[PDB]
């Protein structure tokens, strides 16, 4: 796909499902694209989760620019089903945000710093 | 509210009706502003806002660059112009006198670009790739200041690159170093030491190395003299 | 041995030294310079340069790019490229003055000036007008609007009975200004029209044993003066709304398959750009216009409104009260992801967008 | 009469200036030095009307409305050097339309004005010597 940046390893990519599960139990999360997008724009989430399987790509495209000019961190999945399957849904869902960690705020706070690693920073 | 000069030229700070302190740059057309920023009048002077979460060269500034090498009259090649922000402020610095080639090869941006140098003569805009110098040195001359922002894993090659092109000997260069962009798995401060050791491995003479933190994660630029 | 340049400035020769041996300055004009410079892209030398490799007559040339090389083989002489030279340095370094030099401007004021709108020429080669164009529409539609109330309070001095019975403002514009008095009225002239045999009978009678005005020729032109320009707008119109189409499909045309270009473009006013619109969520495109409802429903925390401009759509504002809330937030959803496709980059899935949507309407409908 | 034609008249001023309004953001996608160099919605319209391009523009063709010496030059070469963007003949054309609708209603506005005065100084001539007609009626 060419709306994902970066390369996510598998062991990162279950590290997200499993935050943003922590994250439903145990503090606020957003989820579906339109959900994720007033997250963005409302400078609340900590964390945007975009799937790589979106079906037209074009749904999710505007996230990695509106998050970039908010300056917060997105993240990618392989799977969209996985995803809104996390999220306490059965249905699957192309994007989620985390507003607030909780019971996985370590968790997140490794996420986002490998994110920043094989993105480039230091 | 209290406008003043600064140890660099046409680069300003103000005194706010709250007690803030933010920098600003004589308003080289007054009444229009290029992002969302500010405009204040002073003493029938109008000033843009200048802020450093958006301008790595404010960010420079704040984090205490020692000299500025881009001042009245100066010329700038700008590798990595993108929307416009930053080298609409060297453009305010530069005034009328200098002038400023903004180098950047995404469509998408170069488009807003324009908007910022129809109405600025000390711009000249090139959609081309800064790792062909060849398909713009037909519009340029030499510089005194290679200002270099691309994101490219072997930025600091294609600006030295350029350099040999159009840095005058004695000239300046500002580069930015995007640590993440080279390589996110790296250690961002692994990476700028071994791509300032380029830059004196070629014979850039190193003068200045800042940590753009607060304002810009995972990045740092380097001031150093072209031999 | 020469060194060889090339730049906007013109064609120079350079010996080793760095002193210039000979040069053609280039014609100042915008149009055959930036040709010549996107041609040396591909290797073509400039035109300036092959007149230049013929008054001198050099055995070995070395010249900037490796792309010429092969073109100035071709051309008879023996040539290589140097990358960073020494003389392609001093010949920048003394850019700003050899302008003047070699007589390709007066002074450096306005060298600068033209290599400016060479450079903005060169790279603008390398949906605002679509925006400009339904606002220019809303004003129109608005003026005619304006017109025709006037027109009829005015006209209805002379001839009170037509004002109801013409309920088109077009048509009745026609009439004040094809007949002017009301005894000029004719059946064939009126037939023209489309007014059917029926029509023509109660206009006219209407006319005869009308209640109205005896007024001079000076006031009755003076009324057809509007009627002329309402008649005039209408054309405007139709004309604005086919350029507006042609450029709605051009610039979005997955939003147009959806609302119509018109609606479309009335979206992209309101946000501002299409990659404003792109970045927006359904629940904002859902009440885009209707602002002053929302912030009153924000401010107070009463209720918001359904739809803004998205009202227009034939299926909302045809459906009942209670339809419309849902037909809106699916056009909303749909609209976005129109939106985006357009915005960066897609190629058209407009078709499959709207029987998404008519089939989320037909299931609203059946209930 | 009086009334419904000052009416009008007070329509048309309006629109008017909502087209020139509309016009000059607009064409100055093409030409936005025009903007501030010509003060009057009549002839900035003329320009428009009479050019679309920037191109078209010549000394002679400015010359014969009146344009003066001084001027007819800081046209010329803010078109010379002019930042605006190229654009196809159907997108000035589109443009045009406007310019001569604005065109169009200044000279029906001035018929209205001669109008007005025929009527207001037959209805009512010592308020007309007071106001001038329009204001009066």
């Given at each position: 796909a ?9 062991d990162?990519?279950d590290?997200?499902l499993?935050?943003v599960?922590k994250?439903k139990?145990?503090?606020k999360?957003?989820?579906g694209?339109?959900?994720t997008?007033?997250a963005?724009?409302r400078?609340?989430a900590?964390?945007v ?5 979106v079906?037209?790509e074009e749904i ?5 620019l ?8 997105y993240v990618?999945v392989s799977?969209?089903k996985?995803?809104?399957?996390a999220?306490g849904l059965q ?7 985390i ?5 996985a705020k370590?968790?997140?706070?490794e996420?986002?710093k490998?994110v920043?690693?094989i993105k480039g920073k230091? | ?12 700070e103000?005194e706010f009706?709250?007690?803030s302190?933010?920098?600003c740059t004589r308003?080289?057309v007054?009444?229009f502003?290029v992002?969302?920023?500010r405009?204040i ?6 000033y843009?806002?200048?802020?450093a979460?958006?301008?790595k060269?404010?960010?420079?500034i704040?984090?205490?660059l020692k ?6 009259g100066?010329?700038?090649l ?11 402020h060297?453009?305010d610095?530069?005034?009328?006198n200098?002038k400023?080639?903004?180098?950047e090869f995404s ?5 807003e ?9 000390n711009?000249f805009?090139?959609?081309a790739?800064?790792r062909?110098p060849?398909?713009?040195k037909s ?8 200002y270099?922002?691309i994101?490219?894993?072997?930025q600091?090659?294609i600006?030295i ?5 159009f ?6 260069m500002?580069l930015?170093?995007k640590?993440?962009s ?5 250690d ?5 030491k071994?791509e300032?050791?380029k830059l ?5 003479e190193?003068?200045q190395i800042?940590?753009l933190?607060?304002?810009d994660?995972?990045?740092?630029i380097?001031l150093?003299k072209y031999? | ?8 400035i013109g064609?120079?020769a350079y010996?080793?030294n ?5 040069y ?12 010549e410079?996107?041609?040396?892209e ?5 035109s300036?340069?092959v007149?230049?490799?013929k008054?001198?007559?050099p ?6 790019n490796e792309?010429?090389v092969?073109?100035?083989q071709?051309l008879?002489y023996?040539v290589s490229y140097?990358?960073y030279s020494?003389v392609?340095?001093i010949?920048?370094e ?13 002074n450096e004021e306005?060298?600068?000036?033209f290599?400016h709108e060479?450079?903005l020429?060169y790279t603008?080669?390398?949906d605002?007008?679509?925006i400009?164009a339904?606002?220019a529409?809303?004003?129109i539609?608005?003026?005619?609007n304006?017109?025709?109330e ?5 006209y209805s001095i002379?001839?009170?009975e037509?004002d109801?019975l ?6 009745y514009?026609?009439i004040?200004?094809r007949?002017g008095?009301?005894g000029?009225?004719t059946?064939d002239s009126l037939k023209?029209l489309?007014?059917n045999?029926?029509?023509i009978?109660?206009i006219?009678?209407?006319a005869?044993?009308?209640?109205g005005?005896?007024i001079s ?5 003076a009324?057809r003066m509007?009627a ?7 054309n405007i119109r139709?004309?604005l ?10 610039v979005?045309?997955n939003?147009t398959?959806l609302?119509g270009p018109?609606?479309?473009?009335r979206?992209?006013?309101?946000a501002?750009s299409l990659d404003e619109l792109?970045?927006?969520?359904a ?7 209707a602002?002053k409802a929302?912030?009153?429903?924000l401010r107070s925390g009463?209720?918001p409104?359904?739809?803004?401009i998205i009202?227009?759509?034939?299926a ?5 009260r209670?339809?419309?809330?849902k ?7 749909k609209?976005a992801?129109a ?8 190629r058209?899935i407009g078709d499959?967008?709207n029987?998404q949507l008519k089939?989320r309407?037909?299931?609203i409908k059946?209930?």
């Amino acid at each position: 796909a060419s709306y994902v940046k970066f390369e996510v390893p598998q062991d990162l990519a279950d590290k997200v499902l499993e935050a943003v599960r922590k994250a439903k139990e145990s503090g606020k999360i957003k989820k579906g694209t339109n959900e994720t997008t007033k997250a963005v724009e409302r400078g609340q989430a900590k964390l945007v989760i975009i799937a790589e399987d979106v079906q037209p790509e074009e749904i999710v495209a505007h996230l990695p620019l509106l998050c970039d000019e908010k300056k917060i961190p997105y993240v990618y999945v392989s799977s969209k089903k996985a995803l809104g399957e996390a999220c306490g849904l059965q249905v699957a869902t192309a994007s989620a945000a985390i507003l607030e960690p909780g019971e996985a705020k370590d968790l997140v706070d490794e996420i986002i710093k490998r994110v920043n690693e094989i993105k480039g920073k230091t | 509210i209290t406008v003043k000069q600064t140890n660099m030229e046409n680069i300003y700070e103000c005194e706010f009706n709250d007690g803030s302190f933010r920098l600003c740059t004589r308003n080289l057309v007054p009444n229009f502003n290029v992002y969302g920023e500010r405009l204040i009048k002073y003493e029938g002077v109008e000033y843009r806002e200048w802020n450093a979460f958006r301008s790595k060269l404010a960010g420079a500034i704040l984090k205490g660059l020692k000299t500025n090498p881009i001042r009245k009259g100066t010329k700038v090649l700008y590798l990595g112009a993108a929307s416009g922000t930053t080298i609409s402020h060297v453009s305010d610095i530069i005034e009328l006198n200098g002038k400023a080639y903004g180098v950047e090869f995404s469509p998408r941006v170069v488009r807003e670009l324009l908007l910022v140098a129809q109405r600025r003569p000390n711009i000249f805009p090139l959609l081309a790739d800064a790792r062909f110098p060849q398909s713009y040195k037909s519009v340029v001359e030499n510089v005194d200041v290679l200002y270099v922002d691309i994101a490219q894993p072997d930025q600091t090659d294609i600006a030295i690159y350029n350099a040999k092109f159009f840095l005058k000997v004695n000239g300046d260069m500002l580069l930015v170093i995007k640590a993440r962009s080279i390589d996110v798995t790296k250690d961002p401060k692994e990476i700028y030491k071994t791509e300032v050791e380029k830059l004196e491995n070629s014979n850039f003479e190193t003068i200045q190395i800042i940590n753009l933190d607060p304002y810009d994660k995972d990045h740092a630029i380097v001031l150093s003299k072209y031999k | 041995k020469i060194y060889l340049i090339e730049h906007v400035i013109g064609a120079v020769a350079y010996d080793e030294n760095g002193n210039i041996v000979d040069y053609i300055t280039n014609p100042r004009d915008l149009g055959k310079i930036t040709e010549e410079l996107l041609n040396n892209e591909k290797g073509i030398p400039f035109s300036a340069t092959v007149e230049l490799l013929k008054k001198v007559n050099p055995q070995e040339v070395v010249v900037e790019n490796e792309a010429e090389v092969p073109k100035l083989q071709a051309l008879g002489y023996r040539v290589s490229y140097e990358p960073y030279s020494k003389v392609s340095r001093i010949f920048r370094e003394s850019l700003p003055k050899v302008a003047i030099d070699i007589k390709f401007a007066s002074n450096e004021e306005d060298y600068y000036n033209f290599l400016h709108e060479l450079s903005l020429e060169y790279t603008r080669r390398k949906d605002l007008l679509a925006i400009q164009a339904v606002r220019a529409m809303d004003d129109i539609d608005k003026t005619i609007n304006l017109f025709s109330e006037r027109l009829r309070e005015w006209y209805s001095i002379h001839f009170p009975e037509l004002d109801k019975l013409i309920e088109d403002h077009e048509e009745y514009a026609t009439i004040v200004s094809r007949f002017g008095d009301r005894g000029f009225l004719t059946i064939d002239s009126l037939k023209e029209l489309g007014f059917n045999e029926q029509r023509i009978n109660r206009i006219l009678d209407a006319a005869k044993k009308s209640i109205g005005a005896d007024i001079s020729e000076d006031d009755l032109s003076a009324m057809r003066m509007i009627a002329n320009t309402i008649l005039d707008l209408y054309n405007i119109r139709r004309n604005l709304n086919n350029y507006l189409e042609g450029v709605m499909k051009e610039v979005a045309p997955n939003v147009t398959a959806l609302v119509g270009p018109a609606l479309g473009a009335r979206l992209l006013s309101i946000a501002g750009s299409l990659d404003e619109l792109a970045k927006m969520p359904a629940s904002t495109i859902q009440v885009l216009g209707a602002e002053k409802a929302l912030f009153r429903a924000l401010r107070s925390g009463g209720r918001p409104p359904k739809h803004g401009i998205i009202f227009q759509y034939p299926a909302i504002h045809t459906s009942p009260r209670w339809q419309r809330g849902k037909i809106a937030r699916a056009l909303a959803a749909k609209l976005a992801i129109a939106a985006r496709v357009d915005a960066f980059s897609g190629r058209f899935i407009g078709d499959q967008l709207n029987e998404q949507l008519k089939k989320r309407i037909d299931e609203i409908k059946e209930k």
